[PDB]
Amino acid sequence: ANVTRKQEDARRNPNPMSVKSVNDPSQNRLTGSLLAHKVADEEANIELTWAEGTFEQFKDTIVKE
């Protein structure tokens, strides 16, 4: 609900180039905890076909010693 509220902020207030650089050995980059949140918001959705079976899982285990 705050996404459209954030969207409408800059629409009422509209007020206004990607070149390489070099990794320097006296400077650091984000990693660890906050890097795992950058990778966990953008990945593939899977809508699971939820069932309730499980006798196939039962007897397959029974027949194996």
């Binding site: 390489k20 650089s21 070099v22 990794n23 050995p25 593939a44």
Partner: protein
């Protein structure tokens, strides 16, 4: 029991003094190997199903060390013994040892010194990897040992035994082109390309004058 090399007692820890002397034999030797053979990374992107035509975070910048790392890996790994890096007065200095001259090169030299007076500019290229300095050191050398052949080189002022007409063209067969005016025509091309540049520059000067006047009136 002379003062030159008696083996005479305990002599502990000389195995590295021996082998580094023995290893210097080849460091000077493979200089003789090379002399005889001398004679003869943009920006990348991706197709994400979620975000199509997205730009990746890592290739935005470059490391500048990974391409240096692989360069280092196929290098020789040597274990330093403190007797190898020995330095003397003959260290970190000029010069080398010139290859001692041959009778083959004498008849390429004195005939060049009989036709021309003494012209070290073109003798230097005749001897392809010899330099301007030591042929001048050879010139002062041959005054002292053979003082009579430099007189015969001076005295003979005429066409010699006319065998040098091939040797005239043996110099003139390398990259056959009329250098008296082929040097002129590409230099003409060099100023022709420059004559484009001011036209490309000065028309870029006048486009500045029309735009900076336009926003003045606006």
């Amino acid at each position: 029991c002379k003062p030159n090399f008696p083996i005479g007692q305990i002599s502990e820890n000389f195995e590295k003094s021996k082998m580094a002397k023995k290893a210097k034999l080849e460091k000077r030797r493979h200089l003789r190997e090379l002399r005889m053979r001398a004679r003869q990374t943009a920006i990348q992107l991706k197709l994400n199903p979620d975000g199509t035509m997205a730009i990746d975070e890592e290739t935005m910048v470059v490391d500048r060390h990974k391409n240096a790392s692989i360069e280092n890996e196929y290098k020789e790994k040597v274990d330093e013994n403190p007797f190898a890096n020995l330095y003397n007065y003959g260290s970190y200095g000029r010069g080398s040892y010139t290859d001692p001259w041959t009778v083959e090169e004498m008849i390429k030299f004195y005939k060049a010194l009989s036709m021309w007076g003494t012209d070290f500019n073109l003798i230097s290229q005749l001897y392809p990897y010899r330099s301007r300095k030591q042929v001048k050191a050879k010139f002062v050398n041959e005054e002292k040992k053979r003082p009579i052949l430099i007189e015969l080189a001076l005295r003979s002022k005429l066409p010699p035994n006319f065998d040098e007409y091939c040797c005239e063209i043996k110099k003139n067969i390398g990259t056959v082109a009329d250098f008296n005016e082929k040097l002129i025509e590409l230099q003409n091309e060099h100023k022709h390309h420059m004559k484009e540049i001011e036209e490309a520059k000065n028309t870029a000067k006048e486009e500045d004058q029309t735009a900076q006047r336009l926003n003045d009136a606006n």
